[PDB]
């Protein structure tokens, strides 16, 4: 009934159990033979009696079940925490990796609601990307989480755009380069450049080199708030602007506008929504993460028009493809 539902929604221990079990690679250990609690505790380096208590709640919430007496086995839902599942939900729930670590910022959500400012720095001592610049493991973990998709997640946006009159593509904060590579495979005449931060540029280079695309896709280390390294016919902003508050996003959009060739276009790859369609879990998860990690925000369809106009741009067309959008921006 109504009481049961509210207790479940407000329960902080349940997602922490899911995250703890992910961090211990508990499902992997079961799958690699660790039948009993005794052997599971050995592999995860935990107290048997406490691990049982954890496992009890994992059975209660339907991630593990008991097969034979004392033998715990993942359910269909628990199997998604195997480290080799395509959705990478174990690493995304791993408290040592960048995202689940950043989610501890939600423990201070009232502060963000009162001020509109992110809470990450009050916990970890630096803002999100400064923290990542001083912690190579966090830098690398963040890039690998977002790029867990890379081989196929940019196939759809690359197909949604006519590359016939594109000669060079600049991917501004393009991660490990998977979007650039998707376009390259889709359009052999096109060349590309990825602009990224320290650390990320190295794994982007080796990923692109390992696709056999280093003849087609360059990587430049730099700062997207400074003049861009080069001009281009299509400039990519894929899950970049939501990281930034309005004024920084306009500056980023302004830098991209300065770097368009005649006829060029700015492409935004992001989750958006008509306002009255945005009261959904997918939108809020990303939007509220952006608030507490960085002070960024998801933007409704209506708000893209205004941000575009501040940058001297217009939204020319939107295409729906999670469920993502490709926004095509032209000079106003």
Q: Choose the binding region for ligand S8M from 45-53, 89-97, 207-215, 236-244 (rule: CB under 6 A).
A: 236-244
Q: Choose the binding region for ligand S8M from 34-42, 107-115, 189-197, 258-266 (rule: CB under 6 A).
A: 189-197
**Least CB distance to ligand S8M at residue 200 (A):** 5
Compose the 94-113 pattern: x for residues touching ligand S8M by CB under 6 A, - for all others.
--------------------
Q: Which is nearer to ligand S8M, 249 or 260 (CB)?
A: 249
Q: Choose the binding region for ligand S8M from 41-49, 167-175, 281-289, 298-306 (rule: CB under 6 A).
A: 167-175
Give yes or no for a contact between 258 and 266, defined as CB atoms under 8 angstroms apart. no
- C-alpha dihedral (92, 93, 98, 102), degrees to nearest 10: 120
**What residues between 61 and 90 interact with ligand S8M by CB under 6 A?**
none
Determine how many CB atoms are found less than 10 A away from the CB of residue 263: 11
**At CB < 8 A and 24+ separation, what contacts does 181-184 make?**
181/150, 181/154, 181/207, 181/208, 181/211, 181/213, 181/217, 182/154, 182/155, 182/157, 182/158, 183/154, 183/158, 184/213, 184/216, 184/217
Q: Which is nearer to its own copies, 281 or 317 (CB)?
A: 281
Q: Is 272 in the site for ligand S8M (CB under 6 A)?
A: no
Of 22, 240, 290, 313, the residue at the interface with ligand S8M (CB under 6 A) is 240
Region of 175 please: left (phi>0), alpha (psi -120 to 50) or beta: left
Residue 139 assigned to a binding site: yes
Q: CB under 5 to 8 A by kind: which of ligand S8M, its own copies, none does 89 bind?
A: its own copies
Q: What is the DSSP letter of 64?
A: E
Beta-carbon contacts of residue 155 (< 8 Å; ≥ 6 apart): 182, 186
Q: CB under 5 to 8 A by kind: which of its own copies, ligand S8M, none does 240 bind?
A: ligand S8M
Q: How many residues does the chain have?
A: 332
Q: Which of 148, 224, 153, 239 is nearest to 193 (CA)?
A: 224
Residue 238 assigned to a binding site: yes
Of 44, 141, 200, 325, the residue at the interface with ligand S8M (CB under 6 A) is 200
Q: CB under 5 to 8 A by kind: which of its own copies, ligand S8M, none does 175 bind?
A: ligand S8M
| Residue at token pair 């034979």 | 68
Q: What is the DSSP letter of 133?
A: H
CA angle 109, 113, 119 (to 5 degrees): 45
Q: CB under 5 to 8 A by kind: which of its own copies, ligand S8M, none does 74 bind?
A: none
Tokens of 225: 């708030």
Q: Is 220 in the site for ligand S8M (CB under 6 A)?
A: no
Residue 223 assigned to a binding site: yes
**Least CB distance to ligand S8M at residue 216 (A):** 18
Q: How many residues bind ligand S8M (CB under 6 A)?
A: 17
Residue 224 assigned to a binding site: yes
Burial (CB count <10 Å: 0-12, 13-18, 19+), residue 16: middle
Binding site for ligand S8M (CB under 6 A): 129, 146, 173-175, 179, 195-197, 200, 223-225, 238-240, 243
Q: Which residues are annotated as a binding site?
A: 139, 149, 173, 196, 223-224, 238, 243, 289
Residues annotated within a binding site for substrate = 149, 243, 289
């Amino acid at each position: 009934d109504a009481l049961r539902t509210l207790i479940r929604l407000g329960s902080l221990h349940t997602p922490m159990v899911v995250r703890t079990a992910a961090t211990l690679r508990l499902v992997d250990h079961i799958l690699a033979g660790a039948r009993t609690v005794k052997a599971l505790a050995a592999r995860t380096d935990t107290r048997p009696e406490a691990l049982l208590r954890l496992i009890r709640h994992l059975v209660a919430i339907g991630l593990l079940e008991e097969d034979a007496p004392g033998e715990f086995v993942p359910t269909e839902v628990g199997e998604l925490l195997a480290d080799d599942h395509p959705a990478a939900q174990r690493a995304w729930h791993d408290l040592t990796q960048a995202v689940a670590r950043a989610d501890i910022s939600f423990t201070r959500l009232p502060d963000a609601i009162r001020t509109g400012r992110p809470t990450y720095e009050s916990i970890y001592g630096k803002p999100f990307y400064e923290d990542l610049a001083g912690r190579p493991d966090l830098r690398a973990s963040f890039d690998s989480l977002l790029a867990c998709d890379q081989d196929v997640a940019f196939d759809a946006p690359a197909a949604a755009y006519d590359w016939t009159n594109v000669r060079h593509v600049l991917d501004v904060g393009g991660g490990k380069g998977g979007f650039a590579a998707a376009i390259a495979r889709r359009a052999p005449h096109v060349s590309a450049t990825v602009l990224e931060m320290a650390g990320t540029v190295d794994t982007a280079r080796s990923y692109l080199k390992d696709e056999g695309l280093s003849d087609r896709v360059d990587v430049v280390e730099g700062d997207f708030f400074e003049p861009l390294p080069r001009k281009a016919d299509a400039i990519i902003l894929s899950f970049v602007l939501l990281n930034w508050p309005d004024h920084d996003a306009v500056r980023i959009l302004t830098r991209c506008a300065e770097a368009l060739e005649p006829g060029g276009r700015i492409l935004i790859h992001e989750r958006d929504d008509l306002h009255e369609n945005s009261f959904n879990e997918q939108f809020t998860e990303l939007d509220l993460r952006m608030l507490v990690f960085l002070g960024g925000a998801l933007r409704t369809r209506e708000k893209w028009d205004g941000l575009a106009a501040s940058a001297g741009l217009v939204v020319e067309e939107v295409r729906q493809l999670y469920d993502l959008s490709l926004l095509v921006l032209a000079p106003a």
